[PDB]
């Protein structure tokens, strides 16, 4: 898939044997019987990141690995100096910014979110921004319906797909 590029941090460690790393290659059916069960976005050491990092303006963009000064790096985040500077994808105008990723041992992490109470790609308590790895980061949203939506953040028109319960 699009994730197997050398600018993706790939520090994965399925210590609990969930199967989540296999879900990144082959699309897998999640066990729905397990489903029911304001932070700022900065810089994440790549060593705690597995798979692609997405931020949302609310439009989704991928953040690749760099060194701590913003120079792109191509070693799968395996270098101790590799980072993900999330805030370099924040637009200069706008109060809408959040990101989401998987940490090393298979947990979905999040920061930022809508202005405000909703973090990362979640727009409302029932809707999140759709993006190519939503089902891997949020497998319990697999039956959410896709809606074309239009949002205005500080004047600019955003046209994106929202997945909604």
């Amino acid at each position: 898939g699009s994730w197997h590029i050398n600018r993706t941090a790939l520090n994965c460690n399925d210590s609990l044997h969930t199967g989540f790393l296999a879900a990144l290659f082959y699309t897998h059916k999640f066990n729905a019987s397990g489903c029911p069960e304001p932070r700022q976005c900065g810089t994440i050491p790549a060593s705690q990141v597995c798979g692609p990092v997405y931020c949302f303006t609310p439009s989704p963009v991928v953040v690749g690995t760099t060194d701590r000064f913003g120079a792109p790096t191509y070693t799968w985040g395996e270098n101790e100096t590799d980072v993900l500077i999330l805030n370099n994808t924040r637009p200069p105008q706008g109060n809408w910014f959040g990101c989401t990723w998987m940490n090393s041992t298979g947990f979905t992490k999040t920061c930022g979110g809508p202005p405000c109470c909703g973090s990362g790609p979640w727009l409302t308590p029932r809707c999140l921004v759709d993006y190519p790895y939503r089902l891997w980061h949020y497998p319990c949203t697999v039956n959410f319906t896709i809606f074309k939506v239009r949002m205005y953040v500080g004047g600019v028109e955003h046209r994106l797909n929202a997945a909604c319960n």
Partner: antibody
Amino acid sequence: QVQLVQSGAEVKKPGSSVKVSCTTSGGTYINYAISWVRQAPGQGLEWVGGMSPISNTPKYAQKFQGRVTITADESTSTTYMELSSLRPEDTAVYYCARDLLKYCGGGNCHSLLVDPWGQGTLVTVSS
Amino acid sequence: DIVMTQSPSTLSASVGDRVTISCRASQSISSWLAWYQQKPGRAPKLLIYKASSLETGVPSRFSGSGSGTEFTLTISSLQPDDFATYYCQHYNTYLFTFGPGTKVDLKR
């Protein structure tokens, strides 16, 4: 509380075939790649084959080329090992275990046979 | 094909001893080596992967060392639960291959 449950013991004449199953329950995902390892009476462990967690296609020790076919029923979380042209030395306890992608290096990821294993299936091949 | 061998084939030691057992690969296998423990009549158990990484839940008295073609497993202080047969195993995308195993029994 994932569990792997194998089908029951089998008795076969030489030259026949046997099809053993492994069903997963209690999992985070409905299906897992499964591999098979056997142990003859008094002997060591011998990998036979299973489904790859990357390609979701069978992979075998090529010692078994042409008489092992591995298949999977996605709707029943079951994987099957069919071993043909059976010979007395195929008499063994056959275990299954998830072939699970565990860690990555340099963009390449590696899978291990991880806990829990199935309980074992005795297959006896004899006239 | 890559062939795994182990030494010694059997070892008698006491509770509390330091034990080191060895595994050799016919060709270079980098760090793609794992150790499994097996008690008679039961399924094996993964202890170590990537030559030296402990599997989740495995006591710290276990350790592994080596790279390339020479590997060891070490038990810093043998305990009653440790008497068992230990198999090394090379893994890659295409196959797994087990070594012949080393049986450690309790000396009395």
